[PDB]
Structure formats: C-alpha cells, structure tokens
Ligand binder design. Structure first.
Ligand SMILES: CCCCCCCCCCCCCC(=O)OC[C@H](COP(=O)(O)OCC[N+](C)(C)C)OC(=O)CCCCCCCCCCCCC
Ligand SMILES: CCCCCCCCCCCCCC(=O)OC[C@H](COP(=O)(O)OCC[N+](C)(C)C)OC(=O)CCCCCCCCCCCCC
Ligand SMILES: *[C@@H]1O[C@H](CO)[C@@H](O[C@@H]2O[C@H](CO)[C@@H](O)[C@H](O)[C@H]2NC(C)=O)[C@H](O)[C@H]1NC(C)=O
Ligand SMILES: *[C@@H]1O[C@H](CO)[C@@H](O[C@@H]2O[C@H](CO)[C@@H](O)[C@H](O)[C@H]2NC(C)=O)[C@H](O)[C@H]1NC(C)=O
Ligand SMILES: *[C@@H]1O[C@H](CO)[C@@H](O[C@@H]2O[C@H](CO)[C@@H](O)[C@H](O)[C@H]2NC(C)=O)[C@H](O)[C@H]1NC(C)=O
Ligand SMILES: *[C@@H]1O[C@H](CO)[C@@H](O[C@@H]2O[C@H](CO)[C@@H](O)[C@H](O)[C@H]2NC(C)=O)[C@H](O)[C@H]1NC(C)=O
Ligand SMILES: *[C@@H]1O[C@H](CO)[C@@H](O[C@@H]2O[C@H](CO)[C@@H](O)[C@H](O)[C@H]2NC(C)=O)[C@H](O)[C@H]1NC(C)=O
Lengths: 362, 362, 362, 362, 362
C-alpha cells in the first residue's frame, strides 16, 4: 500500500542497523557469491599490445542476512542506479585487464534486485580489454588459449569466496564471426588461490580456445611458392647448350621467390623470433638456390669440355665429361623432387603433432 | 501570467504526488513508447574490429497520466537539460553497441516537451559505435546487412513495450557518400522478443543494406591479370627453336602475376579464410604455370628429336616427333582459351547467383 | 566604489527579476545574435571517416533588455567562467559535427562581457571535428567544398534568429600550410532554414574551397608511366629477326607497368569506384599490351614465311609476307604515337572542363 | 605556534579583504609575471596533422600587494592543490595548441608558494600538443622552426604583461634522442603584441630549431640510384651486334629504377607538392631513359646499314654508317658522365645554399 | 565491541588533533617510506613516440606517530577507498611518464591499512606510459636500458625521503612473452638526488634490461642477401663469349638485391640515422655492383680483341688480351670471396664487441 522508494530508503537509512562499508554476517563465516558472464561481442585480437577486448554482462548473486521484508506483497525490489553507494557490493577486479569502463547510454546500465529472504542480484554491462600472451612459434597452424580470471581486492579467502554457477556460467551470444580465429565451445572453468604474504585470495578463471584458419594462408604464400619450386625444376629438362635460357629461368625463379616472400611480409604479424612461414620461405629459397648451383656445376664441366675440344686421350675426356654431365643432370632430375617430398612430409608431420599437443594441455 | 520555470518545479516538486523512479500508471497496463531515428552521418565501416559508427537523433514519445495543466495558455512546456533527473525516462540501451556518448557542444543537446494531456517528447543527439559481423566469402561482390536493435534494461514486456513509428520511423539525411559501400533505401523494421529466464523483453530492430562497388576492383587486379594471361598465351604463337625467347616470356609472365598479386595484398582487407579475389589469383597463376609446363613438355620432345638427329627408322621418329610437337602446340593453342572461357563463365555465374541470393534473405 | 563581484551576483541574484532558463524579452520579438569565427588551426583531412578537424574561436553578440547599470563608471563587466550557468546563453550546435570539446588549459577558456545597454559578448575557444562528404571521381585534379553550418536546438525562427557579421565574419590566421590541399579565400556565407514539422529553424553556413596540388602526382605515377610507354615504343624500331630482344623488351615493359601501378596503390586513398589515376594506368597497360600483340601478329607471319621457305609461287608469298610484315611495322610505327596523342588530348580536355565546372557551382 | 592550514584559510577567508576574481592592485599599474619552461620529453613530430607533443613544467612568478605575514617564522607557505580556486591566477593559454591536459598521478601535480612580501610561485606539470606548419620543398636537407607562444585571455596589455626570465628561461633535460630530427641549443625568445580591435595583448614566444639527419637517406635511395645509373652506363661499353644483351641491360636498369623509386614511397612522408627526392628520382629515371634511346638511335642506323648490305656507293654508306655509329657511341660515352656531373654539382649547390639560407632567417 | 567505521571517522574527525594536509611529526625528522612495485603486464614498446606502457601495483609503507589504538582486538583497520582525502599521503610522481591513470573496475582499486603502532600500508593498481629514449646505431643486435624513477613534488630531502625495500622490491609476474624483446632478471635499483635551486629532492630508480632477438632478422634479410651474393659469384665461372647469359645474371642479381632491400623497409623501424642493416645492404649491393663492373672490364678487352682480329704483332696482342682476360677472371674468382670473408669477420667482430660493451655500462 506504500510506494517502494519510500520504503527502500528506510532499510539502509541513517537510523537503521545498516553500514555500507561492512561485510554481511560480520565476524562470521565468509559470504560467497555466484557469478555469471554473458559475452555480447568479441574481437580486436591484437598481437602487438598482446590483448583483446570484450563486452560482458557480469551478474553476481549473493545472500545477505538482513534486508528482508516478510510482510510485503512484492517479492522483488529494484534499487535506483544512481545511489548504488548505499548498498554493499563485493570488491571484484579482473587480474589481467588493461583497461575497463562502464556504458553510458541513456540510462545507467546497472541493476539491483533484492528478494524476500535477502538474496541480492547485481547485473552490470561493461566493456574491457584483457591482456593475453601469445606464442607464435608455429604461426599459421597455431591454437591460442585466452583466459580471464577475477579476484578480490583486499578480502581474504576466509572473508570472501568466489564461485562459478552450476548451470550455464559462461554464455556466448550467437553469430560472432571473428575475422581471424574460430572460437570453440570448450569453456573450461577453473579455480586459483592467490597465495600471498597476507593470506590466500579467491579466484575463478574462464578459458577460451581459439583456432586459426589456414585457408587464406594456403592459397596465398604456399601454392605459389610450391608452384615456383616446380617451375625451377623445369631447368632440369632443358639441354645444357641453351645457356641463357636456363640461366634466365634460374635467376628469375630466384627473383620470383624473393618478391613472393618480401611482398607478403607486410601482411604477416611482426615478431622477432622464427615462425613456420619463414622456414618454408627459407627452404623454398634454398631450393631455387640449389637448382642454379647445379647448373653452374654442370656448365663448368661442359665449358672445360669445350676448352679441351679446343685443345684418343684428347677426346676420351670429351665423352667422359659428357657422360659426367648427363649423369649429374639425371641424378639431380631424380633427386630434387624426392628430398623435397621427404622434407614436406617431415614438415607437415612435425607441425601436426605440435599443434595437436598444444590442444591437449589446454 | 506566471513564468513556467516557477511552475514546472511544482509539478515534480517535493510536496507533490510524483516519484522520479516509478512507472507511469503503476500496477497497471504497460506504457508503450514511439521511437524515431534520424541519422546525420554514417561511415568508418571497419572490418578488423567489426563495427561501424553513427550519429543519431533518437526521439521518443510516450504518454503519462499525470503532469497535465488544463488551465494554462501555453500548450507546450520545456524542461531544462541540466535537471533531467527530476523526470522519469524509460530505460533504453542498444544491444550490439561497443561504445556510446552524448554531445558536449555549447549547450547540452537534450530536449524535453510536455503537452497538455501529458504526452512527453524526448529528443537527444548521440553518437555511438554498433558492432556488426561481416562475412567475406565473396569479397568484391558482397552485400552486407548491418542491423541495430534497442532493448529495455530490467523491464518486462508486461511493464514496458517499444513501438516503431507509423510514418517515417527511420530517416536518413541527404548526401552521405560512403567511401566503400552504397546504402540502399530498404530500411526494413522488425521486432524481437528477448526470451530469458525472468521473462520476455521488448525489442525493435532497424536493418540497413549496403552494396559494395566493384568499379575500382575491376580496373585494378582483374583487367591486368586477364591481360597478362593473354600475354602468356603469346608463347603459343612463337616457334620452338627460339628457346630463350619463349622461356623469357614465360617466367617473366609468372613474375608479373606474382608481383601483381603480392603488390595488391596490402590494399585488401585481412581475413584468414578464402575470398573471391585469391581464387582468381590462384587460377591466373595456374594458367601461367601451365603455359610453361606445356613448353617444357614440347621442348623435351624437340630436344630428344635433336638427340636422335645426332644419332629410315633413324629419321622416321624425326618427323614423328615433329608432328607430335606441332600437334601439341596446336591443341594447346586451341584448348587454352576455351577452358579459361568455360571457367570464367562458371565463375561469374556461381558468383552472381550467390550474391543475388544474399539479398533475398535480408 | 564597490567591487564588481559584489555587484554582478545581485543582478542575477535570487531576489531579482532574472530567470536563467528564459528568453530575453519573452512573449515578444525574437532576439537575434551576431556570430564570428576565427580559425586557429586546420587539417587532418581524412577520407576514410570523411571529416576534418578545426580549432575555432566562436564569438557571439546579442542584446538583452535587462542587465543594465546606467550608474557605474566601468562600462564593461566580466563574468567568472566557473558560474556560467547563471546567465542565459542561446542554444547553438553544429549540424554536421562528429565530436567536439572545450579546452582545458590553466584557465577555463571562456569570456563574458556585459556592456552598459545590455549587450552581451560571449567568446569561447573550442575544437571539433566536422563531417564532410568527398567525391573522388577525378582524384588528382579535384576541388573540394567543405562546409559548416550551425543551428538552434529547440528554438523556432520566430523565437531565435542567427545572423552573420557584416565585416569580417570568418577570419583565418596566417600560415596554415595544409599537407595535401590549398585553401582559397572565397569564404562564401549562406543561410539555411530547417523546415520541419514543428516549424522553421534558423541556420547560417560557412563554405570553404580546397584545391588539391598535382605537383607530386605529376612527377610520380605520370612521367614514369609515360616514359615506359615511349620505352615500349622502342620495339617498333628493332628488326624482326631479333626475336628474344623484342620479346624481352615487351614483357619487361609490361612488368615495369605493373610494378609501377601496384607499387603506388598503398599511397593512394582507398575507394571502391573508379578514379582518374587508374584510367590512366589501364590505358598505359593496354598500350604495352598492344605493342606486344603487334609483335605476335608480325612474328606469326614471318614464322610462316620461314615455314614456306622450308617448303615462283613458292617464293612469291615470301616477298608478299615480307612486304606485309614491313607494312604492319610501319603503320604501327606511325599509328601508335598518334592515337595516344589523341587520347591524351581528349583526356586532359575532359578533365580540365569537369574540374573547372566543379568550381562554378560552389 | 599555530598550524599553517588554520592560517592560510583566514587570509583568503570569507571575512577578509580578498576577492578571488579580481586583479592585484586593481585600478592601478599592470601586474607582470615571470615565466619558466622545463621540457621533460619531446617528440611524436607528425607531419600529417602538422603538430608535435611536449611535457612542460610551466612555472610562474608574480607579485601581489596583499597576502603578507610579517610576523611568522616560516617564510614560505604551501597551498593545497585541491582548493586552487581560492587564489587568483593569471589567465594564460597557448595560442597554437591543439589539445592539452594536466597530469593525474597519485597527487595533483600542482604547487603554490607564497613568500613573506607576497610573491607567488605557481609551478605545474602539463602535457600538450602544439601545432606547427612544416614546409618540405627540400625534404631530406630541410631545417624546421617550431615555435610556441603564450597569450592572455581577455586581459589587455595595460592590465597584464608577460615577461621571460632573465637567466635560464627555457631549459631542456638531457638525453632526449629524437627519432628523426636533432634539436639545437638556439632557444631564441621573442615577443609578440596581439593588436586587436579591443586593444593590445601581451605575448612571449619560444622558438626551437630542428635539423634533419640525412644519414639513412644517403645510404638508401641515393647510393643505389647512383650505382644503377653507372650500371646503365655499362651499355656504352658493349658492342652493337650484341643486341639482346644491351636491350636486356637497358630495360632491366629502367625496371630497377622504377622498383627502387616505388618501393620507397611508403617510407617517405606524404605531400602533394614536389620535394628534393623525386626530382632526383625523375632525373635518374630520365638518364636510364636516355641511355636506351641512344641505343635505339644507334641500332636503327646499324640495321639500315645491314639493309643496305643486303642491297662503291653501295658500300660507301656502309663505312659511313659505321663511322657514324661509332662516333655516336663515343660522344655518348664521353658526354653522359659529364652532364650528369654538371647536374649533380648544380643540384648540391642549389640545395646547400637554400638550406643555409633557411637557418639565417630563423 | 564497536564497528570500526564508527571508530575510524573519530581518529581523523573534526574534533581531533588531525590535519590532512600536514606532515607526520611536523617540524622534526623526515618521514621515510618503503616502496614496492609488482608489474602485471609489460609491452607496447613503441619507438616512434619513444615510450612503453606498464601496469604496476605500487605499494607504500610509512610510519605515522599518531593514529594508534592500543586498546582494540583488531590489529588491522581498513579505510574506505571513497574518502581517501581524509588521510595524509606522500606526494609521489613519476619523472619520465607521458600519461597515467587509475583503474575503474567494479570497486575502486585502492587499499589502506593502519596497524597498531601507526604504520600505514597503501597499495594501488595503476597503469601508465613511461618515456624511454632508444638508440639504434646497431639495430638487430642492440640491448636497451629502460628505466623508471619516482620523485616527490615539492618536498625537500630533509622533509621526505624515499627508500627501496630490502627483500623483493621489484617483482615481475611470470609468463610475459614480449613480442620483440626479452626481459632480463637484472633489476638494479639505484638512487638519484635532484639538485635544484630550492634544495635536494629524493629519488629512487628501477632499471630493466631488454635484449632483442635476431632469429627472424637472420632467416630474413641476411640469408637471402648472402645467397644472392653467392649467386652473383656464379658469373665468375661462366665463359666470356656467353655475353647475354652473364649480363642477364648480373643485372637480375642487382634487381634481386634491390627488391630484397626495398621490400623489407616497411618492416624495419623508421629513423633518420644509419643502422647495422643498411650497411649490410649497402655492401651487398656494392658487391653485385662490382661483379658487373668486373664483367664490363673483361668484355671491353675481349671486344677490342675481336676488333683487332678484324684488323705476328697483329695476333700477338690476341693472345696477350686473352691471357689478360683470363688472369682478370682468375684473380677476381679468387679475390671476391676472400675480401667478403674479411669484411664479414670485421663486421661481426665490430658488432659483437660494441653490443657486449653496451651491457657492461648498464
Ligand atoms: C641544370 C640543372 C638545374 C637544376 C635542376 C633543378 O634544380 O630542378 C629544376 C627542375 C624542376 O622542374 P619543376 O619543379 O617540375 C614540377 C612540375 N610542376 C611545376 C608543374 C609541378 O627540374 C626538372 O627539370 C625535373 C622536372 C621534370 C619535368 C617536369
Ligand atoms: C630433415 C628436415 C628436418 C626438419 C627441418 C626443421 O624442422 O627445421 C630445422 C631447422 C631450423 O634451424 P634453426 O631454427 O635456424 C634459426 C637460427 N637461429 C637458431 C640461430 C635463430 O631448419 C633449417 O635448417 C633452416 C635454417 C637455415 C639455417 C639457419
Ligand atoms: C560458502 O559460505 C558458507 C557460509 O555461508 C561457508 O561456510 C560453510 O557453512 C556451512 C553451513 O554452516 C558448513 O556446513 C561448512 O562447513 C562451512 N564451510 C567451512 C569451510 O567450514 C562455505 O565454506 C562457503 N563455501 C562453500 C563451497 O559452501
Ligand atoms: C500499449 O499500451 C496499452 C496500455 O496503455 C496496452 O494495453 C492495451 O490497452 C487497450 C486499451 O485499454 C486494450 O484495448 C488492449 O487490450 C490492451 N492490450 C492488451 C495486450 O491487453 C497495449 O497492449 C500496448 N500495445 C499496443 C500495441 O497497443
Ligand atoms: C532581429 O530582431 C528583431 C527584434 O529585436 C526582429 O524584429 C524586427 O523588429 C524591428 C524593430 O521593431 C521591426 O522593424 C521589424 O519589422 C521586425 N521584424 C519582423 C520580421 O517583423 C527582426 O526580424 C530580427 N531580424 C532582423 C534581420 O532584423
Ligand atoms: C611591470 O609592472 C610595473 C608595475 O608593477 C609596470 O609599471 C612600471 O612601474 C614602474 C615603477 O613605478 C615605473 O618606473 C614604470 O614607468 C612603469 N611602467 C610604465 C610603462 O609606466 C611596468 O611597466 C611593467 N613592465 C616592466 C617591463 O617593468
Ligand atoms: C629515516 O627517517 C629518520 C627519522 O624517522 C631519519 O632520521 C634518523 O633518525 C635516527 C633515529 O633518531 C638517527 O639515528 C639518524 O641519525 C637520523 N638521520 C639523520 C640523517 O640524522 C633518517 O635519516 C631517515 N633515513 C634513514 C636511511 O634512516
């Protein structure tokens, strides 16, 4: 029969047994809370500053022994988002966050709900930037583990405990469509206990798995580099007396490999250690290097063959140097695809096992 | 006969039946509102963080049963934009927004208008960044659907309903001139009902259609790549004994295709899956690959023809290998334009149908 | 004989006939104001988000019927920039602005001056980002019109009118030195009347003209492309039997044109429609395309000439095919500079007239 | 014997002859101030938005006729940085600044010190972005003058005067290490008098000199371009009958000059007028253009020599065309280094004098 | 038996001997503090604006002679992070910081703890951007020293002293994974005394060592440039009469060196002085320059050999010019690897000693 605004200001009023900066059931057992996270948006995964940015709906539920009506018909009251300083809220902060802020749309995006027995539901909508460290030892086949973890600030484990929800603790809205990665539905929820000098502190931690697509990285920087290795292998099927043809093919294949590598370096992320891409670019450059050194090793012999033709022993080394040159051009014609196939097997095997392993440790 | 500032402070005064944080006609039917959106500016459509940014004029109109004069000549009162906290405003927020803010020009860009019967008009001017997910499976021919949707924050469907306006709900100022897309005058306005555990929540949603121009993407990265495929086809019209001419044309056409592809990768947007552009760059590289492998398959036969001329059966395989080489150079001279025309037909058909389909589902 | 701070607080005091949120000479004729704009800095003209950023000194002058002394020696009073909320200020906002803010140097950059009769001078210093739409159909020869316009927010034309100053309304400080454009001293000042459902609203609008220099765009991407067209024309002066010389010149000229075009695409602004630069790059690529197709049309005839020399009628088509080839090499030697000169005349004429036209409409 | 906080609030108390918004010795001579600037950090010199950013320690010293103790042992009092609004401070602002802000570390970075006679020392620590216009007509050899100037806001020259300090007015902390320029120890301090309609306003102006290093710009884009001009000059020492050798050297030298120029354009700053770098790139491209046109002028004569050998007068023009060709190849072999050395002398002289001149005007 | 909030407001109450803006044990010995720094995150090391960004946990511990209970069971009290203005805090600021801010997660990230005797523990969590100057004279082998230092603001050394902690003053959380550098566990902690005109000011300074990995910089821009120098050395093993083969190898090796250098310039950081990378790119370009000038010096002699064969003295200079050419091709075949090996030894020695030296000075 009375408006609730004229009642909610008398529970936490001046003449009432309520202090705003005090724990519920003080000098007693610790008051635990139940958390829930609803991600609206996800992305801007940047490797230079090593972070990402989210929009979450953090919802907390805790019990409080006072603030009970037991004589009113309305079972749920709502507190005004201006005077949030009147109620007690548990000190929560994100451990690995860079920057965070509230939302400033036409209403203050806050919500407080007090039930009959004294249960409090507190749901906000915030956006924030979480730091995550990334390792790119195997870049176009990597998986990434991006975690979050939320602490207390000055309250011990015997004073305030955090708890994940039992059913649907972390929910993700449908249709996110990351530009680089693919998020997985693992969502494993763990615990940490911050052991300090003062005492143990509570922690809970969510953990997302991201897998990188290699579709674009296959069509571009892999198929052209493979095709130009096969194009460098064309010089094993051309006769030796056509000297500027095989030289012009060899050096231009090296030029094609360099402009293929250096033309793509602006698109790749920038780190100071080796990746999986530049090992492939190094071996692909070393093959077009070796297909020209094989030609220089052949042409030196055929040139000093012609120098001895200018000078049966005079012409026995003629047919000896011809059979020597053709046996080099045959054993290179057979050997050069085979060691590259052996390297490509050992490459794709040593990368599939390592990426598979990086998923099992979580 | 009295100034309105000395009257408007007595409607929502202390000794008056008004509470600021209470619903109109409380414990009754839900108070619906009528919304209107006027876009001033539109752009900064970024794909990396998957959002865009607007400047809107959000105008709301709702009825309120109290706050009526019925005895004053002025039919329209104006409230001061400083003390907006005195009146009740419906809690509205954008569901898929990243960040939002008001405008801070010489006056506070707010407006409140109270009519005779109690109708309230509330018009603000805000700027904000809406998240939209983009799919670029067919990049230079794509259409994009960019939506917005606006919710309540804590009020149920039986407590607060949203409604689009009947005539001219969403208006767009003239002369916007996006740098990438072209906006269409569809402006289809739909509804959503957020079904949660607590209850149904109201929603209305605007929906814009953007179509990407392919004028620049046709002149650049399509016409040069086609012309250099025709330039690679010149090597089917040159005689076989000119070996370094056709080799120097073939490898330099491959070099031209690689520097055409890798030179343009900084201008394209960055994703990890395949697009429509690099399928064309893959087939265009595979054609200049195959026009050199056809030459290596011809020159191997003409070289072992000359090797048997160094060694009628001795010269029957001479004319056999010549007719074999010329029949390969003829069937490649006829086949290579035809399968490329068949591929270009199947390409433009499989992209026109998919883009047309992406418009019908809206 | 008294300090003015102890007098200025009694004009707009509590017991005085002053209301802060009321119009001067209420229920009467509209109070007009006189505006003045002094630009300190100008630049950051960005095409991606389609805006620019200024630093202005907005100065307003209006009359007010009260607030007159008529008994004090000091003719000019100064109000403190903290308590600006005591006086009435006209609601002004920029219609096409993205974001705006004040200045927060050691003093609040505000100024209020009240004369004897009641004239008020109000001069602030603000910085703000105005949206402007740009059209780049003719990119390196374009002119741009960048306007600003300032409105009222909720006051009708019969309630508040805006007026430009008579002498020196818009002033520009000397030595601005834009990095891209050149500002002109046109400064044409117009009016708008915002016709809405509620009524007519006042507007005044400044309008700046910017002209883009083409000095860098002439030395780079025009002179090299022209010179390599003349370099492709060298292949009309070399004999036909030197086959790998003219082929190696032709394909490398095509390679030079592609690396000239794609090497410059990162420096150009990014739009989705055609510009004036890539039409020149398309015709310059089509010329080095046609100088190689002319060589393939010549070499096909001289090759089947040699094929008939392998096979007077046997040698009548010998001299017929030689006179046919030399007549093609002569008519291409004369035709290829002439149609390019005709195209370059029609190009520079169709661009000079369009740019000249874009200046006259203002 | 009393705490100073209980005394400093009674000098500027309510019942005391102090007004906060009033000039010292009102209706009298103007109160001058003494300024000092200590730069902590310097950099982010950006040419696109034409500004730079500093961190200064602005310190002011002025006299005030009241606020004297003459009966206390402590000669220096300190005011709390929260209630800075109690004291009078002179209105100072930077004329050519884009944006400015205070510092928000654990304490408010403010300082107030009141001596015995009434001298006030006011020292803050602020960071701010000053606009400077840059002219890049001679880019890799330019000097830049970057000034700052600080005004009053509404106080006339007969009301408030600014003054530089006598010894050490502008100090610079050691070890700044700009990434592009080198700062010089000139630090010339001048005056301005802002003549307006209202009256003269005071100004003082600091002025820094920055000199750009050309060490990187010499090793890269100068030495390779010079070396490839000498590489194009190799074609004057090769015999004429080796046609595809000299053609393949000539066009590839042109290709090397284009990929040297266009490969470096992303590193250069972006303006619309000419610089010193692209004049060198234009003349270096015109030399490799002229070394190929000299070859086409030679090969046309030697080809029509061979055409007349196909047709003593028949063979008198044989030796005439041979002596004509060798005299062209000799006079080009001697002329081409000499006019390039004359151009390189006139180039380095016309740039050294202009850069030297740009230092003397300051 | 009483709640601590009703006691903590009476220690620093109005009727109590506490002033907030006064030093503990005033007119006495200086109150020293003990500091501690815990870095959570580290990175965004940018060279253009010459700074980096951290997230620290600054913890201070000082004694205060008042504020003692000596009659309560709870030994540790906690102050509310809203009313931090009631207590005295020492004025601390970072000397070389660009910008700083607090954290605005659901609770104010502050902590105050008052022990029995009067010891105060004050622990905050802040993020801030420290300026550091970098020198890149030896870029891919450099070490960097990045310091921080924290001052007082207006308090003398005889009024406030800073002190590092004895055990674990600066701690670093595990698993940081910088994208460019590698942090070392040196953490040397020094002192500074700011000698000014007013007096000595206290300072303590932390100092981090960062070492740059050269793994990526070895695979890319070093191995390809070395391999193409060995590819340019192939032209010393090809006979002289194959003129367009060795010319086409030489100029294309120069083209490969230029597109290798200019293709990588976008990935390197931008400075105006020389580095270690472009000295290697200059010598690697000068080697492929000299391997073509050696060929022009050989081919000039063999061409004028053929010119004298067109004209025993007539043929004595034939064998003289042949033995002269082969002795040049032999002494270049032996000399060109040796002086490059001597240069590569003097290069790696002069860079290892300088980098080693830059570690010892700290
Ligand atoms: C004897 C050498 C004299 C010294 C050369 C020198 O300092 O530069 C003079 C000219 C500059 O020509 P300019 O400047 O070319 C720019 C074209 N514009 C004005 C329409 C934008 O340099 C040139 O001539 C190159 C300009 C190429 C043609 C335009
Ligand atoms: C049989 C094939 C075995 C599989 C090959 C494979 O997985 O990579 C092994 C090596 C990696 O050499 P690593 O790593 O080279 C980096 C040089 N460092 C350590 C000083 C920075 O791969 C290489 O050998 C390429 C490294 C080039 C020489 C350095
Ligand atoms: C949750 O909070 C409760 C107190 O509200 C913690 O204390 C438990 O209280 C129950 C009920 O009296 C006892 O049965 C348990 O023995 C108490 N716990 C301990 C450790 O003594 C409780 O620990 C908190 N955590 C959980 C997971 O329930
Ligand atoms: C709009 O608000 C009204 C109440 O102001 C809602 O209730 C309707 O009230 C009318 C008038 O009494 C009745 O005729 C309807 O039956 C009521 N609606 C229902 C669902 O019972 C109304 O629902 C709201 N919405 C619309 C679209 O009118
Ligand atoms: C400027 O404001 C005046 C009122 O202060 C407007 O009204 C004019 O008042 C004058 C003086 O009485 C009359 O002569 C005019 O007829 C009034 N105008 C109209 C339209 O009736 C005036 O309109 C405003 N504008 C201008 C340009 O003066
Ligand atoms: C500095 O301020 C003084 C007043 O405090 C200005 O006035 C001068 O006062 C002295 C002392 O009475 C006279 O000798 C001068 O003649 C006054 N100046 C003038 C222009 O009349 C003074 O002008 C200010 N400036 C300087 C540089 O001293
Ligand atoms: C730390 O603060 C103390 C005062 O609290 C400083 O003064 C010292 O006080 C002790 C105890 O009375 C004396 O033994 C010393 O002689 C005092 N120091 C001096 C310089 O006179 C003390 O200097 C501060 N610093 C350190 C390092 O202790």
């Amino acid at each position: 029969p009375m408006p609730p605004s004229e009642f909610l200001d008398k529970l936490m009023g001046k003449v009432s047994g309520y202090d705003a900066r005090i724990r519920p059931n003080f000098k007693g057992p610790p008051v635990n809370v139940t958390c829930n996270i609803f991600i609206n948006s996800f992305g801007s995964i940047a490797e230079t500053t090593m972070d990402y940015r989210v929009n979450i709906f953090l919802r907390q539920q805790w019990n409080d022994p006072r603030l009970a009506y037991s004589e009113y018909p309305d079972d749920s009251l709502d507190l005004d988002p201006s005077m949030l300083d009147s109620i007690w809220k548990p000190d929560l902060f994100f451990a690995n966050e860079k920057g965070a802020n509230f939302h400033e749309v036409t209403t203050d995006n806050k919500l407080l709900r007090i039930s009959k027995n004294g249960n409090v539901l507190y749901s906000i909508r915030i956006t924030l930037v979480l730091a995550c460290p990334m390792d790119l030892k195997n870049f176009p086949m990597d998986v990434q583990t991006c975690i979050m973890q939320l602490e207390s600030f000055g309250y011990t484990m015997n004073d305030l405990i955090f708890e994940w929800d039992e059913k649907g603790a972390v929910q993700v809205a449908d249709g996110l469509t990351l530009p680089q990665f693919i998020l997985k539905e693992e969502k494993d929820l763990r615990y940490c206990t911050k052991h300090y000098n003062t005492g143990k502190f509570t922690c809970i931690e969510a953990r997302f798995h991201l897998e990188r697509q290699m579709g674009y990285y296959l069509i571009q920087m892999y198929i052209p580099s493979l095709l130009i290795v096969i194009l460098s292998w064309v010089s094993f099927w051309i006769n030796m007396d056509a000297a500027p043809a095989r030289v012009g093919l060899g050096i231009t294949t090296v030029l094609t490999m360099t402009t293929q590598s250096s033309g793509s370096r602006a698109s790749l992320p920038k780190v100071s250690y080796v990746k999986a891409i530049d090992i492939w670019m190094a071996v692909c450059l070393l093959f077009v290097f070796s297909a020209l050194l094989e030609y220089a090793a052949v042409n030196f012999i055929a040139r000093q063959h012609k120098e001895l033709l200018r000078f049966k022993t005079v012409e026995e080394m003629r047919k000896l140097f011809i059979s020597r040159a053709k046996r080099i051009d045959t054993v290179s014609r057979v050997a050069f695809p085979l060691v590259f196939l052996i390297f490509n097997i050992f490459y794709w095997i040593t990368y599939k096992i390592i990426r598979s392993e990086d998923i099992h440790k979580q």
